[PDB]
């Protein structure tokens, strides 16, 4: 489990309860929840292991954000809003859909103004519709003055020191995430370091280390769902994915003010708690440190993942067609390495 | 089959008969036997398909070679002589044995003078022993005057024009091969072009095109038996090697004066005819033409073989240990591409 639901100050009762969590097939153990001043927290980040930091004040000025405040102040830029008839918002790269014309995504992307997102959300709730929305938009220069001021008030002192201490590359973006209760982002890994800053509502985060690659079966690299797990967590096909019976997760529920370090290459499944209302999150994506000058053997799990990705990319290019990658790989192994 | 046994001139009867051929599980069709002046012969060489040329005179001065002549004239250099208790002289690279300390070769290499090879051969025949010898030695500068003169008398005019016409690289070596009746060199492919010049006795040659890679199951690249088939032709394991049930060979029996073009990457199984006496062959190995400037898609079979070899080599280097290549490849494919 995630650990006992945290009790809110002022005797406001349990923030959430276990009935708001979806049911899955695998065991988990809790991600540590620590103060940013705790040396164990620094130890985990340094070793690229997840930790929830409870007191960074990383996005303190954003803790007042709700739909009314954001709509008044976030400007008139476009926001990417995904729509689905399922709770699962499986990520896919539109640019790879040409490689797999048989892939029919279950979520669709629509660009709209922030007030149109609020209105569509309101229409759905009144009509009792089952349609789900998930706003996922990189923050940019079109935001209004008050959002600029809030953003400037993030704890750049703390996170800049992390970036420097860990040798990371640049901050590439901040993703603003606004979801409906019950929304799920299925398990995947990212090739950047991530500080995941919860603002409103509660998200259950289930992480898996890079050495569970064999259990989580990412799509082919050239598939639209590169880096995402092929396993349906709600109905796992153990005939196709037998080592999913061996997966073990690291679990936590983050609430307003919490920051989760999601290390590069770590798998993560994220869900907005059932009956928990809307959720708001801002993340901080950093490029990882460069390949070290001297390679130490045996390689770490994340280095083998990087190798496998590059083998798939190179074969797709050399064979001139990503569909020939599988057949060549099978020819290489059958009766030779298996 | 190989085609009707050729009838020798002067009414000397069939050179050989089908009872001298070993029995295998797969069908074959005959390699064309043509004159070097036949445009179809040039067409096959140009398209990297095998052909037996009957009238090249490529090694005409060597057709008088026997053990007595060679012993008198081939000098006092060392000759590599393989010894085995089986008819199969499976090739292996001594330099890769460190990677696979569990590999126990069934043939051993011993360096000796040519007269010691003749004497060991004579001891075996008198004592009725079952030990087999196979002399396999690159021709070099230590050979005596009469062998030098014979070698100078090869048809360099004809073969030099082939090398030039096909864009091949340099002649890298000439392998002298002297085997006992019944000796077999198991199926493998070479990364050079080969003109195979038969001098004494008869060899059955069974070739398989590069697109039968999937049926012939070469050892891992880092194994001592790189480029050789794992299938025991005398007892094929169809559970491990199911597509060996689909292999189809191109077959011929070469005799004195014949030259077989064995194209680069073509699999070949070579056997000295049962009860046929000793065999003598000299081959001519040429580096292949370079990779073309413009790549045409889809790739040819031999280009996919080159890619697979390089993937295995690169992974062995990057993982720091050739034993980790298999596990990484299986992790890449299981539940992802298979």
């Amino acid at each position: 489990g995630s650990g006992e639901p945290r009790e809110e100050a002022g005797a406001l009762g349990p923030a959430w309860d276990e009935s708001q969590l979806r049911s899955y097939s695998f065991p988990t153990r809790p991600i540590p929840r620590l103060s940013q001043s705790d040396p164990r927290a620094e130890e985990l980040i340094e070793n690229e292991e997840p930790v929830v930091l409870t007191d960074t004040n990383l996005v303190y000025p954003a803790l007042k954000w709700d739909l009314e405040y954001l709509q008044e102040n976030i400007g008139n830029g476009d926001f990417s809003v995904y729509s689905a008839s399922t709770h699962k918002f499986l990520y896919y790269d539109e640019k790879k859909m040409a490689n797999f014309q048989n892939f029919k995504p279950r979520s669709n992307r629509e660009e709209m103004k922030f007030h149109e997102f609020v209105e569509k959300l309101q229409d759905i709730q009144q009509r009792g519709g089952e349609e789900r929305l998930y706003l996922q938009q990189t923050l940019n220069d079109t935001v209004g003055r008050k959002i600029v001021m809030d953003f400037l008030g993030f704890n750049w002192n703390w996170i800049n020191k992390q970036q420097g201490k860990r040798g990371w590359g640049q901050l590439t973006s901040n993703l603003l995430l606004i979801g409906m209760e019950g929304n799920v982002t299925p398990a995947h890994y990212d090739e950047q370091q991530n500080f995941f800053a919860q603002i409103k509502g509660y998200k259950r985060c289930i992480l898996f280390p890079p050495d569970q690659f064999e259990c989580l079966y990412p799509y082919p690299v050239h598939h639209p769902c590169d880096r995402q797990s092929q396993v349906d967590f709600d109905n796992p096909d153990y005939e196709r994915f037998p080592n999913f019976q061996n997966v073990v997760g690291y679990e936590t529920v983050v609430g307003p003010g919490d920051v989760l370090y999601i290390p590069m290459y770590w798998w993560h499944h994220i869900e907005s708690l059932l009956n928990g209302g809307i959720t708001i999150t801002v993340n901080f994506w950093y490029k990882g440190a460069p390949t070290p000058k001297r390679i130490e053997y045996p390689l770490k799990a994340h280095q083998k993942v990087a190798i496998m990705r590059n083998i798939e990319k190179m074969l797709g290019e050399a064979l001139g067609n990503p569909q020939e990658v599988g057949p060549l790989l099978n020819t290489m192994i059958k009766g030779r390495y298996n | 089959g190989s085609g009707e046994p050729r009838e020798e001139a002067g009414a000397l009867g069939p050179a050989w008969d089908e009872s001298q051929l070993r029995s295998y599980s797969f069908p074959t069709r005959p390699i064309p036997r043509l004159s070097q002046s036949d445009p179809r012969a040039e067409e096959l060489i140009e398209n990297e398909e095998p052909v037996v040329l009957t009238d090249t005179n490529l090694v005409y001065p060597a057709l008088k070679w026997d053990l007595e002549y060679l012993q008198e004239n081939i000098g006092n250099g060392d000759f590599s002589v393989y010894s085995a208790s089986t008819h199969k002289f499976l090739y292996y690279d001594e330099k890769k044995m460190a990677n696979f300390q569990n590999f126990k070769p069934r043939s051993n290499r011993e360096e000796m003078k040519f007269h010691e090879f003749v004497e060991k051969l004579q001891d075996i025949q008198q004592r009725g022993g079952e030990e087999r010898l196979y002399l396999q030695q690159t021709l070099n500068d230590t050979v005596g005057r009469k062998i030098v003169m014979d070698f100078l008398g090869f048809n360099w005019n004809w073969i030099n024009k082939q090398q030039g016409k096909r864009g091949w690289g340099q002649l890298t070596s000439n392998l002298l091969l002297i085997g006992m009746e019944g000796n077999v060199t198991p199926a493998h492919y070479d990364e050079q072009q080969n003109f195979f010049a038969q001098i004494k006795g008869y060899k059955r040659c069974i070739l398989f095109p590069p697109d039968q890679f999937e049926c012939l199951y070469p050892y891992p690249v880092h194994h001592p038996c790189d480029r050789q088939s794992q299938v025991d032709f005398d007892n094929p394991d169809y559970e491990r090697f199911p597509n060996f049930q689909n292999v189809v060979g191109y077959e011929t029996v070469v005799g004195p004066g014949d030259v077989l073009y064995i194209p680069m990457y073509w699999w070949h199984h070579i056997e000295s005819l049962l009860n046929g006496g000793i065999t003598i062959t000299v081959n001519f190995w040429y580096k292949g033409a370079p990779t073309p400037k413009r790549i045409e898609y889809p790739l040819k079979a031999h280009q996919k073989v080159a890619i697979m070899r390089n993937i295995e080599k690169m992974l062995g280097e990057a993982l720091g240990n050739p034993q980790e290549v298999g596990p990484l490849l299986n992790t890449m494919i299981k539940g992802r591409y298979n």
């Binding site: 973006s173 090739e191 950047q192 880096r227 994506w285 390949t291 390679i295 990087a306 590059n310 | -």
Partner: peptide
């Protein structure tokens, strides 16, 4: 060279490129 080639990380994340 080849080892560093195969070890090179990408930077892809779950955010759609335009």
């Amino acid at each position: 060279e080849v080892v560093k080639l195969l070890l090179e990380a990408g930077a892809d994340v779950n955010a759609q490129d335009k």
